[PDB]
Tab-separated table of N, CA, C and O in Angstrom:
chain	number	residue	atom	x	y	z
F	350	UNK	N	12.234	-159.145	1.676
F	350	UNK	CA	11.436	-158.912	-0.012
F	350	UNK	C	11.298	-157.511	0.375
F	350	UNK	O	10.246	-157.143	1.500
F	351	UNK	N	11.613	-156.556	-0.238
F	351	UNK	CA	11.202	-155.076	-0.559
F	351	UNK	C	10.596	-155.188	-2.005
F	351	UNK	O	10.219	-154.774	-2.724
F	352	UNK	N	8.668	-154.858	-1.243
F	352	UNK	CA	7.198	-154.396	-1.339
F	352	UNK	C	7.375	-152.840	-1.872
F	352	UNK	O	6.557	-152.895	-2.341
F	353	UNK	N	8.101	-151.871	-1.898
F	353	UNK	CA	7.943	-150.694	-1.957
F	353	UNK	C	7.927	-150.423	-3.457
F	353	UNK	O	8.046	-148.847	-3.988
F	354	UNK	N	9.014	-151.405	-4.498
F	354	UNK	CA	9.216	-151.658	-5.913
F	354	UNK	C	7.501	-151.154	-6.601
F	354	UNK	O	7.642	-150.935	-7.988
F	355	UNK	N	6.320	-151.633	-6.347
F	355	UNK	CA	4.971	-151.864	-6.845
F	355	UNK	C	4.388	-150.606	-6.485
F	355	UNK	O	4.767	-150.399	-8.003
F	356	UNK	N	4.692	-149.414	-6.023
F	356	UNK	CA	4.113	-147.990	-5.703
F	356	UNK	C	5.022	-147.111	-5.350
F	356	UNK	O	5.835	-146.351	-5.552
F	357	UNK	N	5.922	-147.993	-6.263
F	357	UNK	CA	8.163	-146.484	-5.921
F	357	UNK	C	7.558	-145.985	-7.872
F	357	UNK	O	7.925	-144.656	-7.927
F	358	UNK	N	6.798	-146.261	-8.784
F	358	UNK	CA	6.646	-145.768	-9.497
F	358	UNK	C	5.555	-146.787	-9.903
F	358	UNK	O	5.656	-147.902	-11.059
F	359	UNK	N	4.304	-146.537	-10.195
F	359	UNK	CA	3.152	-146.738	-11.732
F	359	UNK	C	2.399	-145.752	-11.489
F	359	UNK	O	2.370	-144.671	-10.732
F	360	UNK	N	1.189	-146.916	-12.765
F	360	UNK	CA	0.279	-145.370	-13.201
F	360	UNK	C	-0.263	-146.400	-13.146
F	360	UNK	O	-1.716	-146.631	-14.269
F	361	UNK	N	-1.062	-147.108	-11.760
F	361	UNK	CA	-2.171	-147.949	-11.959
F	361	UNK	C	-3.361	-147.034	-11.723
F	361	UNK	O	-4.280	-147.255	-10.563
F	362	UNK	N	-4.036	-147.138	-13.288
F	362	UNK	CA	-5.816	-146.043	-13.273
F	362	UNK	C	-7.036	-147.161	-12.866
F	362	UNK	O	-6.660	-148.523	-12.812
F	363	UNK	N	-8.101	-146.804	-12.282
F	363	UNK	CA	-9.246	-147.935	-11.934
F	363	UNK	C	-8.346	-149.139	-10.576
F	363	UNK	O	-9.157	-150.001	-10.993
F	364	UNK	N	-8.183	-148.313	-9.794
F	364	UNK	CA	-7.502	-149.985	-9.032
F	364	UNK	C	-8.703	-149.224	-8.090
F	364	UNK	O	-8.336	-149.259	-6.571
F	365	UNK	N	-9.498	-150.836	-8.511
F	365	UNK	CA	-10.645	-151.350	-7.039
F	365	UNK	C	-10.367	-152.342	-6.597
F	365	UNK	O	-10.305	-153.513	-7.804
F	366	UNK	N	-9.590	-152.344	-5.417
F	366	UNK	CA	-8.798	-153.453	-5.108
F	366	UNK	C	-9.586	-153.607	-3.960
F	366	UNK	O	-9.836	-152.509	-2.911
F	367	UNK	N	-10.316	-154.949	-3.516
F	367	UNK	CA	-11.352	-155.357	-2.654
F	367	UNK	C	-10.401	-155.871	-1.417
F	367	UNK	O	-9.531	-157.506	-1.708
F	368	UNK	N	-10.097	-155.938	-0.431
F	368	UNK	CA	-8.839	-156.812	0.529
F	368	UNK	C	-8.357	-156.252	0.988
F	368	UNK	O	-8.427	-154.956	2.180
F	369	UNK	N	-7.058	-156.933	1.224
F	369	UNK	CA	-5.154	-156.146	1.970
F	369	UNK	C	-4.912	-155.783	1.158
F	369	UNK	O	-5.121	-156.381	-0.160
F	370	UNK	N	-4.578	-154.871	1.087
F	370	UNK	CA	-4.182	-153.629	0.069
F	370	UNK	C	-2.289	-153.996	-0.149
F	370	UNK	O	-1.670	-154.327	0.513
F	371	UNK	N	-2.462	-154.641	-0.864
F	371	UNK	CA	-0.500	-154.778	-1.301
F	371	UNK	C	0.571	-153.767	-1.640
F	371	UNK	O	1.385	-154.204	-0.507
F	372	UNK	N	0.138	-152.877	-0.713
F	372	UNK	CA	0.971	-151.345	-0.349
F	372	UNK	C	0.570	-151.502	0.870
F	372	UNK	O	-0.695	-152.016	1.606
F	373	UNK	N	2.652	-151.516	1.268
F	373	UNK	CA	1.945	-151.240	2.905
F	373	UNK	C	1.922	-153.042	3.167
F	373	UNK	O	1.191	-152.373	4.210
F	374	UNK	N	3.094	-153.119	3.098
F	374	UNK	CA	2.500	-154.680	2.979
F	374	UNK	C	3.524	-155.243	4.346
F	374	UNK	O	3.026	-155.864	4.688
F	375	UNK	N	4.489	-154.225	4.556
F	375	UNK	CA	5.678	-155.119	5.401
F	375	UNK	C	5.068	-154.998	6.956
F	375	UNK	O	6.019	-155.251	7.642
F	376	UNK	N	4.050	-154.413	6.826
F	376	UNK	CA	3.494	-154.097	8.676
F	376	UNK	C	3.406	-155.103	9.594
F	376	UNK	O	3.110	-156.192	9.879
F	377	UNK	N	2.132	-155.959	7.274
F	377	UNK	CA	1.984	-157.517	8.211
F	377	UNK	C	3.100	-158.632	8.063
F	377	UNK	O	3.854	-158.120	6.943
F	378	UNK	N	3.426	-159.602	8.279
F	378	UNK	CA	4.554	-159.872	8.475
F	378	UNK	C	3.437	-162.045	7.774
F	378	UNK	O	2.597	-163.049	8.934
F	379	UNK	N	4.102	-163.305	6.903
F	379	UNK	CA	3.516	-164.166	6.418
F	379	UNK	C	4.833	-164.742	6.392
F	379	UNK	O	5.482	-164.492	6.478
F	380	UNK	N	4.275	-165.773	5.681
F	380	UNK	CA	5.506	-167.007	5.779
F	380	UNK	C	5.709	-167.183	4.260
F	380	UNK	O	6.231	-167.206	3.595
F	381	UNK	N	3.664	-167.391	3.757
F	381	UNK	CA	4.497	-167.507	1.807
F	381	UNK	C	3.436	-166.728	1.229
F	381	UNK	O	2.022	-166.768	1.956
F	382	UNK	N	3.659	-165.912	0.148
F	382	UNK	CA	3.242	-164.929	-1.284
F	382	UNK	C	3.065	-165.898	-2.699
F	382	UNK	O	4.636	-166.085	-2.706
F	383	UNK	N	2.290	-166.120	-3.626
F	383	UNK	CA	2.008	-166.866	-4.342
F	383	UNK	C	1.918	-165.478	-5.057
F	383	UNK	O	0.951	-165.174	-5.253
F	384	UNK	N	1.708	-166.164	-7.124
F	384	UNK	CA	1.271	-165.475	-7.916
F	384	UNK	C	0.821	-166.650	-9.327
F	384	UNK	O	1.544	-167.058	-8.659
F	385	UNK	N	-0.338	-165.810	-9.245
F	385	UNK	CA	-1.049	-167.342	-10.215
F	385	UNK	C	-1.278	-166.290	-12.151
F	385	UNK	O	-1.573	-164.702	-11.519
F	386	UNK	N	-0.772	-166.085	-13.304
F	386	UNK	CA	-1.137	-166.204	-14.218
F	386	UNK	C	-2.022	-167.508	-14.571
F	386	UNK	O	-1.743	-168.712	-14.435
F	387	UNK	N	-2.356	-166.989	-15.801
F	387	UNK	CA	-3.932	-167.728	-16.315
F	387	UNK	C	-3.631	-166.987	-17.595
F	387	UNK	O	-4.102	-165.743	-19.304
F	388	UNK	N	-4.611	-168.263	-18.784
F	388	UNK	CA	-4.556	-167.832	-19.977
F	388	UNK	C	-6.279	-167.656	-20.548
F	388	UNK	O	-6.095	-169.396	-20.050
F	389	UNK	N	-6.776	-166.328	-20.852
F	389	UNK	CA	-8.011	-167.055	-20.903
F	389	UNK	C	-8.462	-166.278	-22.487
F	389	UNK	O	-7.956	-166.003	-22.922
F	390	UNK	N	-9.961	-166.307	-22.417
F	390	UNK	CA	-10.661	-165.636	-23.849
F	390	UNK	C	-10.302	-164.085	-23.919
F	390	UNK	O	-9.759	-163.048	-22.799
F	391	UNK	N	-9.709	-163.833	-25.460
F	391	UNK	CA	-9.520	-162.328	-25.670
F	391	UNK	C	-10.223	-161.474	-25.812
F	391	UNK	O	-9.856	-160.145	-24.987
F	392	UNK	N	-11.940	-161.914	-25.304
F	392	UNK	CA	-12.775	-160.691	-26.052
F	392	UNK	C	-13.571	-160.689	-24.166
F	392	UNK	O	-14.180	-159.892	-24.231
F	393	UNK	N	-13.004	-162.054	-23.293
F	393	UNK	CA	-13.798	-161.841	-21.950
F	393	UNK	C	-12.447	-160.620	-21.028
F	393	UNK	O	-12.154	-160.888	-19.698
F	394	UNK	N	-11.303	-160.837	-21.864
F	394	UNK	CA	-9.820	-159.846	-20.552
F	394	UNK	C	-10.641	-158.340	-19.856
F	394	UNK	O	-10.592	-158.712	-18.772
F	395	UNK	N	-12.013	-157.507	-21.130
F	395	UNK	CA	-12.724	-156.522	-19.858
F	395	UNK	C	-13.687	-156.893	-19.423
F	395	UNK	O	-14.664	-156.523	-18.411
F	396	UNK	N	-14.487	-158.478	-19.777
F	396	UNK	CA	-15.249	-159.279	-19.170
F	396	UNK	C	-15.231	-159.693	-17.955
F	396	UNK	O	-16.088	-160.122	-17.958
F	397	UNK	N	-14.464	-159.900	-17.978
F	397	UNK	CA	-14.239	-160.270	-16.003
F	397	UNK	C	-14.648	-159.502	-14.702
F	397	UNK	O	-14.042	-158.230	-14.374
F	398	UNK	N	-15.350	-160.556	-14.155
F	398	UNK	CA	-15.663	-158.973	-13.219
F	398	UNK	C	-16.548	-160.472	-11.818
F	398	UNK	O	-17.049	-161.418	-12.146
F	399	UNK	N	-16.141	-160.056	-11.205
F	399	UNK	CA	-17.055	-160.374	-10.060
F	399	UNK	C	-18.197	-160.861	-10.136
F	399	UNK	O	-18.704	-160.285	-9.391
G	450	UNK	N	-21.711	-135.245	20.988
G	450	UNK	CA	-23.182	-134.970	20.694
G	450	UNK	C	-23.961	-133.774	21.425
G	450	UNK	O	-23.692	-132.815	20.754
G	451	UNK	N	-25.321	-134.576	21.697
G	451	UNK	CA	-26.158	-133.992	21.159
G	451	UNK	C	-26.877	-132.434	20.691
G	451	UNK	O	-26.639	-131.593	20.296
G	452	UNK	N	-25.752	-132.767	18.468
G	452	UNK	CA	-26.246	-132.339	17.845
G	452	UNK	C	-26.378	-132.588	16.308
G	452	UNK	O	-26.305	-133.587	16.551
G	453	UNK	N	-27.512	-132.031	15.917
G	453	UNK	CA	-28.328	-132.747	14.901
G	453	UNK	C	-28.253	-131.680	13.855
G	453	UNK	O	-27.169	-130.299	13.186
G	454	UNK	N	-28.053	-132.628	12.572
G	454	UNK	CA	-26.844	-132.149	11.418
G	454	UNK	C	-27.455	-132.499	9.829
G	454	UNK	O	-28.300	-133.801	10.390
G	455	UNK	N	-27.044	-131.821	8.685
G	455	UNK	CA	-28.714	-132.479	8.096
G	455	UNK	C	-27.549	-132.036	7.038
G	455	UNK	O	-28.545	-131.787	6.101
G	456	UNK	N	-26.908	-131.898	7.218
G	456	UNK	CA	-25.811	-131.874	5.496
G	456	UNK	C	-25.495	-133.403	5.663
G	456	UNK	O	-25.963	-134.583	5.232
G	457	UNK	N	-24.961	-133.717	3.806
G	457	UNK	CA	-25.901	-134.513	2.323
G	457	UNK	C	-24.824	-134.016	1.428
G	457	UNK	O	-25.622	-133.833	-0.274
G	458	UNK	N	-23.832	-134.983	1.531
G	458	UNK	CA	-23.300	-134.716	0.320
G	458	UNK	C	-22.405	-135.765	0.264
G	458	UNK	O	-22.221	-137.031	0.344
G	459	UNK	N	-22.407	-136.537	-1.482
G	459	UNK	CA	-21.371	-137.663	-2.376
G	459	UNK	C	-20.476	-137.717	-1.365
G	459	UNK	O	-18.994	-136.608	-0.071
G	460	UNK	N	-20.067	-139.331	-0.520
G	460	UNK	CA	-19.160	-140.122	-0.095
G	460	UNK	C	-18.382	-140.539	-0.455
G	460	UNK	O	-18.407	-141.291	-1.737
G	461	UNK	N	-17.291	-139.992	-0.086
G	461	UNK	CA	-15.710	-141.306	-1.050
G	461	UNK	C	-15.450	-142.332	-0.221
G	461	UNK	O	-15.295	-143.071	1.182
G	462	UNK	N	-16.199	-143.640	-1.370
G	462	UNK	CA	-15.649	-144.404	-0.606
G	462	UNK	C	-14.465	-145.189	-0.785
G	462	UNK	O	-14.262	-145.137	0.799
G	463	UNK	N	-13.699	-145.161	-1.385
G	463	UNK	CA	-12.294	-144.806	-1.057
G	463	UNK	C	-11.181	-144.570	-2.731
G	463	UNK	O	-11.028	-143.244	-2.977
G	464	UNK	N	-10.511	-144.901	-3.559
G	464	UNK	CA	-9.638	-144.372	-4.703
G	464	UNK	C	-11.243	-144.470	-5.988
G	464	UNK	O	-11.994	-143.938	-5.929
G	465	UNK	N	-9.874	-143.481	-6.304
G	465	UNK	CA	-11.551	-142.820	-7.797
G	465	UNK	C	-12.268	-142.594	-7.585
G	465	UNK	O	-13.337	-142.616	-7.537
G	466	UNK	N	-12.221	-140.968	-7.517
G	466	UNK	CA	-13.286	-140.262	-7.017
G	466	UNK	C	-14.513	-140.666	-8.191
G	466	UNK	O	-14.571	-139.805	-8.793
G	467	UNK	N	-15.683	-140.200	-7.363
G	467	UNK	CA	-17.229	-139.832	-8.197
G	467	UNK	C	-17.268	-139.080	-8.826
G	467	UNK	O	-16.968	-139.386	-9.612
G	468	UNK	N	-16.123	-138.197	-7.962
G	468	UNK	CA	-16.760	-136.039	-9.183
G	468	UNK	C	-17.676	-136.167	-9.725
G	468	UNK	O	-18.232	-135.992	-10.822
G	469	UNK	N	-19.460	-136.935	-8.474
G	469	UNK	CA	-20.295	-136.531	-9.486
G	469	UNK	C	-20.594	-137.107	-10.275
G	469	UNK	O	-22.062	-137.300	-11.179
G	470	UNK	N	-21.202	-137.915	-9.640
G	470	UNK	CA	-21.493	-139.746	-10.445
G	470	UNK	C	-22.730	-139.847	-10.440
G	470	UNK	O	-23.267	-140.749	-10.934
G	471	UNK	N	-22.164	-140.466	-8.645
G	471	UNK	CA	-23.651	-141.777	-8.585
G	471	UNK	C	-23.232	-142.526	-8.175
G	471	UNK	O	-24.651	-142.947	-9.046
G	472	UNK	N	-22.464	-143.420	-9.146
G	472	UNK	CA	-22.658	-144.192	-9.567
G	472	UNK	C	-21.683	-145.494	-8.555
G	472	UNK	O	-22.416	-145.392	-7.632
G	473	UNK	N	-21.190	-146.089	-8.798
G	473	UNK	CA	-20.619	-147.260	-7.811
G	473	UNK	C	-19.464	-146.933	-7.335
G	473	UNK	O	-18.857	-145.614	-7.105
G	474	UNK	N	-19.941	-147.356	-6.065
G	474	UNK	CA	-19.661	-147.083	-4.780
G	474	UNK	C	-19.830	-145.996	-4.540
G	474	UNK	O	-18.947	-144.765	-3.592
G	475	UNK	N	-20.523	-145.130	-4.907
G	475	UNK	CA	-20.967	-143.692	-4.853
G	475	UNK	C	-22.637	-143.426	-4.920
G	475	UNK	O	-23.277	-143.365	-5.185
G	476	UNK	N	-23.132	-142.761	-3.032
G	476	UNK	CA	-24.016	-143.546	-2.622
G	476	UNK	C	-24.526	-142.099	-1.608
G	476	UNK	O	-24.121	-142.076	-1.149
G	477	UNK	N	-25.673	-142.045	-2.110
G	477	UNK	CA	-26.911	-140.417	-1.257
G	477	UNK	C	-26.395	-140.365	0.540
G	477	UNK	O	-26.367	-142.032	0.715
G	478	UNK	N	-25.901	-140.000	0.864
G	478	UNK	CA	-25.566	-140.759	2.758
G	478	UNK	C	-26.758	-140.889	2.926
G	478	UNK	O	-26.779	-141.822	4.266
G	479	UNK	N	-27.920	-140.038	2.860
G	479	UNK	CA	-29.452	-141.136	3.502
G	479	UNK	C	-29.942	-141.521	2.471
G	479	UNK	O	-30.098	-141.712	1.500
G	480	UNK	N	-30.526	-142.891	4.352
G	480	UNK	CA	-30.938	-143.752	2.798
G	480	UNK	C	-32.570	-143.794	4.106
G	480	UNK	O	-32.199	-144.046	5.387
G	481	UNK	N	-33.491	-144.526	3.392
G	481	UNK	CA	-34.806	-144.954	3.946
G	481	UNK	C	-35.258	-146.281	4.573
G	481	UNK	O	-33.783	-147.643	4.224
G	482	UNK	N	-35.261	-146.187	5.426
G	482	UNK	CA	-35.967	-147.469	6.865
G	482	UNK	C	-36.439	-148.641	5.912
G	482	UNK	O	-37.279	-147.902	4.861
G	483	UNK	N	-35.648	-149.816	5.346
G	483	UNK	CA	-37.095	-150.334	4.791
G	483	UNK	C	-37.390	-151.685	5.553
G	483	UNK	O	-37.811	-151.944	6.616
G	484	UNK	N	-39.118	-151.059	5.313
G	484	UNK	CA	-40.034	-151.682	5.955
G	484	UNK	C	-40.978	-152.268	5.118
G	484	UNK	O	-42.106	-151.208	4.716
G	485	UNK	N	-41.007	-153.065	5.503
G	485	UNK	CA	-41.832	-154.150	3.986
G	485	UNK	C	-42.966	-155.508	5.456
G	485	UNK	O	-43.005	-155.320	6.706
G	486	UNK	N	-43.378	-155.650	4.921
G	486	UNK	CA	-44.713	-157.106	5.229
G	486	UNK	C	-43.991	-157.991	5.462
G	486	UNK	O	-43.665	-159.318	6.646
G	487	UNK	N	-43.185	-158.765	4.637
G	487	UNK	CA	-42.639	-159.437	4.193
G	487	UNK	C	-41.168	-158.618	5.183
G	487	UNK	O	-39.683	-159.124	4.645
G	488	UNK	N	-41.529	-159.286	6.823
G	488	UNK	CA	-40.501	-158.379	7.349
G	488	UNK	C	-40.655	-159.339	9.060
G	488	UNK	O	-41.430	-160.522	9.227
G	489	UNK	N	-39.436	-159.291	10.019
G	489	UNK	CA	-39.805	-160.019	11.251
G	489	UNK	C	-39.737	-159.211	11.769
G	489	UNK	O	-40.871	-157.535	12.183
G	490	UNK	N	-40.186	-159.344	13.056
G	490	UNK	CA	-41.177	-158.273	13.941
G	490	UNK	C	-40.009	-157.686	14.700
G	490	UNK	O	-40.902	-155.528	15.848
G	491	UNK	N	-38.888	-158.007	14.574
G	491	UNK	CA	-37.661	-156.953	14.850
G	491	UNK	C	-37.235	-156.567	13.414
G	491	UNK	O	-37.081	-155.249	14.140
G	492	UNK	N	-37.834	-156.543	12.671
G	492	UNK	CA	-37.740	-155.393	11.876
G	492	UNK	C	-38.500	-154.040	11.821
G	492	UNK	O	-39.051	-152.699	10.763
G	493	UNK	N	-40.759	-154.689	12.741
G	493	UNK	CA	-41.314	-153.525	13.050
G	493	UNK	C	-40.755	-152.314	13.495
G	493	UNK	O	-39.732	-152.483	14.344
G	494	UNK	N	-41.437	-151.299	12.539
G	494	UNK	CA	-41.186	-150.003	14.077
G	494	UNK	C	-41.296	-150.182	15.326
G	494	UNK	O	-41.883	-150.206	15.477
G	495	UNK	N	-40.865	-148.762	15.934
G	495	UNK	CA	-40.343	-148.708	17.664
G	495	UNK	C	-40.370	-147.428	18.127
G	495	UNK	O	-39.692	-146.658	16.903
G	496	UNK	N	-41.850	-147.738	19.216
G	496	UNK	CA	-41.775	-146.491	19.687
G	496	UNK	C	-41.000	-145.694	20.420
G	496	UNK	O	-41.486	-146.754	21.612
G	497	UNK	N	-39.391	-145.388	19.959
G	497	UNK	CA	-38.315	-145.240	20.989
G	497	UNK	C	-38.649	-143.539	21.826
G	497	UNK	O	-38.606	-142.517	20.706
G	498	UNK	N	-38.986	-144.184	22.732
G	498	UNK	CA	-38.371	-142.100	23.428
G	498	UNK	C	-37.376	-142.245	24.901
G	498	UNK	O	-37.782	-143.142	25.558
């Protein structure tokens, strides 16, 4: 899997991510990676916070 | 070693630079000790020489 495309051309502002950074992931070796998508309230798209 | 520094500037937590906003993830380097009566014996001040 080539994960360089995530940061090859991106403009993600306000990138406040906690934990392991998805970029520079080839160094770490794992087995399964999952992507989750969901539908929530329309007015709470910017209202979701940790 | 054996050097005393008094520099106090905005600390860089990570990306999205503060730019002098002093907001989230942007705190002063100097912090005061927590000295409250509701603390254990290990939190009391000690005369360390």
